[PDB]
């Protein structure tokens, strides 16, 4: 059989494994789409005997399972009550009981190291308290700040974030922080004395982007600022002995292009070290895919002896595991042409459980030898699909751009192509721009290959995966060399793979990739069909309408509207609409507030004004993340409009 | 004793009079707001003994009453069924019965001359027929430029059908095909020919001529009377049926073109423009916030056929004129007022006029056409007009920077005493091809009642002053129009001692919002500004507004792919760095005439630059909120405007 | 502190224990009322380490838990889906999953001995199939005698089907046809045979024998094991599968027939009634208002197959005995208490008993089968029992008018110090073939708490005292049963000095409401009376009660077309002219056991004759209101009873 659009309904994404404290079993999450085309996620257990069994079952989403320090309770988050709350499932028998009842639910939580309580993140309006509980003429809205809406949740009310202690038995709640403008990552020390959390303590929170690590003495209730504006940080992790705190962070020297590095602080000594300051590699997961997108990645994990940290890193299309010792060495431990998107490390052994995806493998758990870098399959969560349907592999190649710069790309061949045949080529361009295509499972790409298209996808400069200079190169040069890198790849793929039909080329891409799709068709006539998605066409309006417009444009394109309007206009695809003579399908969602739908309307109207071939498809109620986590029926429709457009105009 | 915002809930708009065919009585409409803050409208009869009595009563809207040619039935439109439908009320006893049950309701109707049927306008999806009746996830695929309207939101592209409805049986029969768009329609006195305006262009959204089609009722054959020579509305057959009159123009000046009176003689295949040499716009261009949806009369032939009575807009007035076929034109109901409704007696030189003025909300008057003397027939705002003191609007003229004469009006706070001065608020109307004038304006009374002197003017671009004056703004946005307004502030300061020249505010909506934004970016004399349903960025406007694909070109001068720097130069956002006046930005979420992104861009740039500004966003409201939107929201908009000036001007 | 009406909301009823197969732990059920005054019930686990742990938690009812043969799964019934369905809970980790989705739910289930399937009982209309799933005018034509039930109103004639449900897939398969009725059922330990009790009579409503049918699970072939010899319940196969135990009788005394232990040997075609010569009623006849719907044990085989553990009702006690296949019957668990749930260890001489007594609501106990000594395992009412003073029930005996010995019990109000006297309330139990005794009774505590001495006795007609005593009421309603109760009142006054002989009240429900009505028409000794869900007219009862078409004949002695005057002579309404006791009449609108027309006739006749009476009608409740009905209505009913005695007794 061959991949169909409806196969996205069968996909199952295992993610987020965590060991029991005895290291003999692990809990993890399986996200699926059910018969009613709704998302569900449930907890599963990998057991010592190798059995993999489901432990939660309802028409809801369970997430973020963590074993208590004793191992007797699996804490987790679930939306089964109508909001996301913290529930408690016994590890040895019995159903889960609901622990928290916040009106606004729970975003995140940690266990206390003594297991008597958990620390949960909730949010409160100024008129609300932690005692307010979930309860499952007209007024204008007054806006007075720059950051007043988000793609994730629309109009904001400015609720403040609160970390609360929740007693494991009684459920009694007690605020630990004040009402914070924003709380990010948080973590309590192994001795239970200190709560570290990332906060926005700036006087103008919307326009200043440093983020401070704040330490809270639980007993004394006193807070000390560990960073005092030296950067921004995430994924905090205390060392086993409690004397060091690790964080992923950076100093914003290249704004959103800045490489994320491993920091280690010594709170008692007041000092910090950037362990990977001399390793030109971006820590974390920049990988672009449409499966596992919401999966909880692992931050840095200390080695049990406190000698260093296992970190994932994004290089050359791979997300792999490395060990950064405090003494200096940086060594690979789990390497290969794949996407490591979930990780649990054994409490004592040189062993790990890793969730790994590749172009021909949706995603599964593997036991990994930390010392020898080999793995053994634990799960086969997509067995029928992988046993029935042929997957196209993604073959990497490199090419030189117009200035000699080496670029990396990948090609997939239609698995129905017999020798001597040529397929039309679809170029996929990834968003960000500081993201990374690579060795992960991509249903859209499979669908295109199965529909008879060769698929090219590349990492033009501006991508992550190739170090600080490469990811930064696109800033201020939107539509310059980034655009040459992609067109060099088209030419390079044509010359390197004879199964490509040079006369039948298409291009598609979303967000930045949508900006670049629009840019392309206004600058070359080489393509017979183009599909732009969640795209940008006018940087001037983008700044004032996008939920991040008021800093993104400046950060990426180079300036604000009142600084250099004509530069913004010159880098706007709409400027080149007179040149556009390629049928252009414009896909956009009504509630996409990252790229406002006015971006799509402007381009569609100018093309229609000029008598050009174009069509605008508006997806209701969806946002920018539609293609990854939006309504599954609309994901099907989006894929069908893409494929039908190339079918009409490439075939 | 002085106007308040909540007084808008008290306002009653009497409108749309129509004589019974014997001339002895007349039916009209009264629109109001009930204690649930909801719009109702009901039918009323003026009965010659002088009595005015209510004839419909429920929690619904009755509209457009018309007596049958025999006078025994009053037809009207009502939404009481849940959609607007044609009902019939006996003229001498009994309640109304529903006549039409169309799934998509009725937009408009006319009586047949014999009274046995009525012609109704409905709309049908491609999958629908005239037989479908009213009855109580997939992406949207958009393939055309005109895919949404401020009035309806997203359009489904139903086509228009005119259907004959038998008066006794309600049986329906389609007369037209499924038209892309049907405007005015009228049936000839002999009942044989239906004339209607249609969009017969191959690219309907980008071509703005509209054709008069003549449809032989018996054969259904059609002839195109106009073949693209302009655009037309308000059809009216002569009494002998040999001539067809219409209001129209040839688009020579796009949206600024004067509307003129045309007469067609279908049998001779000739046409003539009867007001070609009269430099006055026919129709009603008046700006107000009361009587906004009141149906205007349309041209009325003299019984003998020697000419037509037409309303027309000039110098702040909407008056009634007689245009003789030979050329001469007389005012026949004139005065410093707004004639917003009209019926002419069947056999006499008498009329019923709905008339508003700055100190009179609006009432019906019996008018002798021989001399223009009036008798009041209604007093629909008696309580409010007896308790609340109204500020008059005093007209004046002044010269602009280049000498051109401009007309304006000043309002002084009624509670102001001899020596005292009040801060001035300048109001700027939208359009721009509209006309401030002598009409009741609740919002202007509220500003006066709040202790503000109120200046409002007709800068060039306004209607009311001839073809050159109304066209002058096109291609010169923020040029001489801005000068006219500033010259008005200066002249007002000079001429009127009660103005406190040290406290000036400015506010306006739509084009008036573009202009408020323009003003605070080009001068700092105002200590406060409120911009409403405004424009800040012409480049995004063209692509997002429901009419942006022609308005920017028609009015600013070009499309973004022709001259983007010219659009930018006239965009108020370009000048945001100069902006030092506290700017309250009012905008509605579902305004698609001026999309909310215009306000959002200006808000963000001002906040980025640390300037004083707030963004107030009205849910579910569209561009017409201040006139016909949710009354509670209308209250809130008025409060937000007055509060901003109170904060920064007092 | 002492008992209040609202304490019924705090009561928790532990019930229905079952051992895991390794005997180290037992699952049970706890029924409670939550803060919404709704009933909940959840699974709990007791383990041999002493821990008592709650295993389900949601806003619903879980019940009937049973470990699978290997003990890795706990099957149980839950209504959380909106219908009662079979759910599976992992025995050692993980949440429950729903196994069945019948549109009509599941009434009962058993495990396959090999653990791979379960057999569930569902019901189906004639147009339904087992494939129909839960999905969360017309005149009604009635053609049979049993056309409605107190439990479920008008019956739709759904037929019962036993279906095999695969554990893994949930794939279902009908095993039986559509049965007129299915009662007990059991799968033999080798998996080859399903035993179930069916109504196989040609006229099902009027013939009351019930057959044990044997069904070969492979072939679905069926055999009738009993062929009309009686009626049967509580089937249990011997460990080696050669014998089938049942609780049954041959109806020789109709509803008064003692229930006995039968043991069949299907292959030999033989049977023994092993308690035929033991004049004791097997099962639980106890009267109480707590634990009402708790699942009793049924007969349990000794692991070696040598005999059966049976509960029995005797002299106010529900106690445990052992019946050897070799003949002897010996006590096992004995005392002045109510054994209302029981599980016996799968291999050792130990049991888990749920035990109630007048001063203990109900808890679980480890019991030694060797000597009967017990250790407390739960304390589910600890706060309540720590805080409120319980009044004990002191038993006594007395002789009736003909010398027959009767057993009764008295309760002294806790707040009553030595020397002081209290008015007496006589409670009369229903049935009549039931048994007052040593069980917790919230209503009786509340009466004691409210300052009333409480007398409750077992007149002839009661169970607990042999075949002759329980049979004695039939054909003698209001005769010696009434004498027994009156003699109990005299005896209590004579023996218990704290009774104020001048202030006597009486109350009772169903049969005891008939008796209350009888009493007040035959004696004026009582100053207050409260009759509940009662009977006043045996003639109409026959035709309107859900069981009237046989109860009256069976109990009162004849049908209305046999001897109407006998029915009238025994109808309390016949004596209404004699009634001089203020009578509160309590009845529910949807009681179809005792229809509300019974209450209305007595009310009307008393009012016609000017007597003191009030009628209180409970909406939406049925006959079982006082035990399992709407908690708020249960409080209202207790409230009205106490208020009536407070008004006339104190
Ligand atoms: Na997989
Ligand atoms: Na209607
Ligand atoms: Na004038
Ligand atoms: Na344009
Ligand atoms: Na300014
Ligand atoms: Na108890
Ligand atoms: Na009874
Ligand atoms: Na008898
Ligand atoms: Na009842």
């Amino acid at each position: 059989l061959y991949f169909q659009g409806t196969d996205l309904l069968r996909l199952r994404s295992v993610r987020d494994p965590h060991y029991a404290p005895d290291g003999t079993r692990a809990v993890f999450v399986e996200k699926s789409i059910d018969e009613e085309k709704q998302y569900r996620s449930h907890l599963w257990i990998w057991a010592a005997d190798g059995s993999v069994r489901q432990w939660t079952f309802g028409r809801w989403r369970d997430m973020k399972p963590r074993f208590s320090p004793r191992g007797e309770i699996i804490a987790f988050l679930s939306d089964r009550s109508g909001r996301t709350q913290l529930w408690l499932l016994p590890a040895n028998g019995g159903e889960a009981r609901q622990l928290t009842f916040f009106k606004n639910g729970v975003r995140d939580y940690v266990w206390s190291p003594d297991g008597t309580f958990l620390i949960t993140l909730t949010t409160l309006g100024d008129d609300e308290t932690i005692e307010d509980r979930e309860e499952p003429d007209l007024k204008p809205r007054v806006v007075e700040r720059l950051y007043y809406k988000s793609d994730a949740s629309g109009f904001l009310d400015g609720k403040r974030a609160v970390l609360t202690r929740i007693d494991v038995l009684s459920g009694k709640s007690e605020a630990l922080t004040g009402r914070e403008e924003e709380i990010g990552s948080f973590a309590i020390s192994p001795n239970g004395r200190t709560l570290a959390f990332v906060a926005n303590r700036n006087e103008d929170p919307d326009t200043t982007f440093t983020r401070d690590i704040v330490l809270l003495d639980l007993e004394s209730k006193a807070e000390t600022n560990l960073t005092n504006g030296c950067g921004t940080f995430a994924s905090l992790a205390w060392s086993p002995d409690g004397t060091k705190l690790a964080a992923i962070g950076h100093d914003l020297a290249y704004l959103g292009a800045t490489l994320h590095r491993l920091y280690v602080f010594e709170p008692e000594r007041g000092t910090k070290r950037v362990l990977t300051a001399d390793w030109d590699v971006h820590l974390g997961d920049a990988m672009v895919g449409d499966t596992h997108a919401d999966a909880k990645g692992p931050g840095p994990i200390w080695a049990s002896d406190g000698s260093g940290l296992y970190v994932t890193a994004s290089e050359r299309g791979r997300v792999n595991l490395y060990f950064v010792s405090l003494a200096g060495p940086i060594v690979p431990v789990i390497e290969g042409n794949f996407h490591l998107y979930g990780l649990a490390i054994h409490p004592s052994e040189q062993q790990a459980i890793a969730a790994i995806s590749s172009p021909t493998s949706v995603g599964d758990l593997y036991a990994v030898s930390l010392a020898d870098g080999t793995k053994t399959r634990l799960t086969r969560a997509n067995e029928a699909l992988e046993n029935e349907v042929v997957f196209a592999d993604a073959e990497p190649f490199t090419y030189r751009s117009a200035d000699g710069l080496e670029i990396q790309g990948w090609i997939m061949k239609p698995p129905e192509l017999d020798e001597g045949e040529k397929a039309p080529l679809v170029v996929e361009i990834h968003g960000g721009p500081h993201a990374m295509y690579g060795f992960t499972f991509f249903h859209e790409l499979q669908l295109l290959a199965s529909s008879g298209y060769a698929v090219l996808f590349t990492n033009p400069r501006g991508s992550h995966g190739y170090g600080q200079s490469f990811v930064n190169a696109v800033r201020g040069d939107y539509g310059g060399m980034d655009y040459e890198d992609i067109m060099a790849g088209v030419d390079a793929a044509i010359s390197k793979f004879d199964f490509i039909d040079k006369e039948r080329l298409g291009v598609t891409g979303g967000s930045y990739g949508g900006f670049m799709t629009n840019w392309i068709v206004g600058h070359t006539d080489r393509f017979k069909a183009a599909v732009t998605q969640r795209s940008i066409s006018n940087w001037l309006s983008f700044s004032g309408v996008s939920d991040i417009g008021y800093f993104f444009t400046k950060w990426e394109v180079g300036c604000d509207v009142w600084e250099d309007a004509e530069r913004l206009w010159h880098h706007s695809p709409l400027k080149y609409v007179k040149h556009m003579r390629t049928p252009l399908l414009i896909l956009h969602s009504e509630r996409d507030y990252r790229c406002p739908i006015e971006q799509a309307e402007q381009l569609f109207v100018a093309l229609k004004q000029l008598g050009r071939e174009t069509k605008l498809v508006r997806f209701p109620d969806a946002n920018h993340d539609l293609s990854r986590t939006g309504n599954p029926a609309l994901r099907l429709e989006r894929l069908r409009h893409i494929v039908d457009w190339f079918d009409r105009y490439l075939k």
Side-chain angles (χ1 to χ4, degrees), chain A residues 609-630:
Chain A
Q609 278 179 312
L610 289 163
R612 315 298 165 95
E613 185 48 38
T614 182
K615 176 184 271 151
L616 168 69
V617 188
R618 312 179 59 118
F619 292 78
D621 287 344
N623 66 8
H624 199 75
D625 301 322
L626 173 61
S627 66
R628 298 171 281 272
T629 66

Side-chain angles (χ1 to χ4, degrees), chain A residues 532-545:
Chain A
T532 196
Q533 329 158 32
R534 47 190 200 284
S535 69
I536 294 147
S537 65
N538 184 350
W539 286 112
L540 289 97
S541 60
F542 182 86
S543 293
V545 192

Side-chain angles (χ1 to χ4, degrees), chain A residues 148-167 169-171 173-183:
Chain A
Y148 64 88
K149 74 175 179 251
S150 82
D151 186 70
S153 83
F155 285 124
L156 300 170
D157 298 337
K159 284 177 245 287
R160 275 137 127 212
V162 175
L163 289 178
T164 61
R165 168 195 199 285
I166 315 297
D167 200 65
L169 304 165
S170 70
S173 67
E174 167 188 74
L176 301 177
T177 61
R179 296 169 193 247
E180 292 288 341
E181 211 291 325
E182 191 204 85
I183 295 189

Side-chain angles (χ1 to χ4, degrees), chain A residues 25-34 37-43:
Chain A
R25 54 173 185 179
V27 67
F28 64 97
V29 178
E30 186 152 331
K31 193 193 187 172
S32 57
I33 297 172
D34 68 9
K37 304 224 211 315
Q38 306 302 306
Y39 293 104
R40 275 162 186 202
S41 59
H42 300 132
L43 313 190

Side-chain angles (χ1 to χ4, degrees), chain A residues 230-265:
Chain A
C230 73
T232 176
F233 309 91
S235 320
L236 308 178
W238 289 94
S239 69
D241 66 19
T243 75
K244 293 171 185 64
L245 180 60
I248 296 297
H250 62 90
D251 68 358
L252 282 163
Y254 301 106
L255 296 177
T258 311
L259 255 50
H260 291 202
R261 322 234 183 218
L262 174 61
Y263 282 63
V264 177
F265 302 78

Side-chain angles (χ1 to χ4, degrees), chain A residues 151 534 588-590 592-597 622-624:
Chain A
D151 186 70
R534 47 190 200 284
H588 216 106
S589 298
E590 304 288 1
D592 179 347
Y593 302 128
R594 172 75 26 87
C595 301
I597 199 151
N623 66 8
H624 199 75

Side-chain angles (χ1 to χ4, degrees), chain A residues 335-399 401-417 420-421 423-494 496-501 504-527 529-550:
Chain A
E335 230 183 324
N337 289 358
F338 55 65
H339 177 189
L340 200 152
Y341 68 92
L343 181 72
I345 287 177
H346 195 282
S348 42
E349 299 179 18
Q350 281 304 88
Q351 306 294 318
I353 296 177
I356 304 171
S357 181
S358 82
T360 75
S361 164
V362 178
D364 273 305
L365 306 188
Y366 298 81
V368 179
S369 159
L370 290 197
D372 300 338
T374 48
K375 63 199 159 73
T376 310
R377 168 182 298 270
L378 299 177
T379 68
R380 207 183 283 280
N382 292 281
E383 156 159 35
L385 180 56
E386 274 150 20
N387 270 346
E388 302 163 9
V389 178
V390 178
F391 293 45
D393 206 343
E395 160 173 349
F397 71 106
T398 65
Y399 58 104
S401 181
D403 65 345
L405 186 61
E406 297 264 10
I407 313 302
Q408 180 168 38
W410 290 258
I411 199 87
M412 316 173 39
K413 167 173 94 151
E416 302 98 315
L417 220 66
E421 279 166 306
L425 174 70
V426 172
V427 180
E428 287 255 8
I429 298 151
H430 71 67
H434 315 306
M436 166 177 84
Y437 276 133
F439 294 108
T440 194
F441 171 82
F442 215 139
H443 174 253
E444 192 177 315
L445 303 191
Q446 294 300 324
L447 181 61
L448 284 180
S450 147
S451 302
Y453 299 94
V455 174
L456 172 61
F457 58 104
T458 71
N459 285 331
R461 75 197 67 194
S463 296
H464 263 304
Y466 309 86
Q468 183 60 96
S469 169
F470 201 81
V471 66
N472 191 65
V474 67
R475 299 214 295 120
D477 187 40
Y478 261 42
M481 294 311 291
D482 57 340
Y483 154 76
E484 309 269 20
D485 297 341
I486 285 168
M487 299 278 332
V490 189
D491 303 337
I494 290 177
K496 273 165 226 259
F497 313 99
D498 69 27
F499 60 82
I500 289 172
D501 179 349
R504 290 173 192 270
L505 319 184
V507 55
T508 188
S511 209
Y512 170 82
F515 151 77
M516 172 72 44
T517 298
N518 300 337
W519 187 265
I520 276 161
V521 297
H523 287 78
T524 174
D525 287 336
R526 284 273 297 293
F527 293 96
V531 175
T532 196
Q533 329 158 32
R534 47 190 200 284
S535 69
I536 294 147
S537 65
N538 184 350
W539 286 112
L540 289 97
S541 60
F542 182 86
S543 293
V545 192
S546 173
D547 64 340
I548 60 162
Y550 71 88

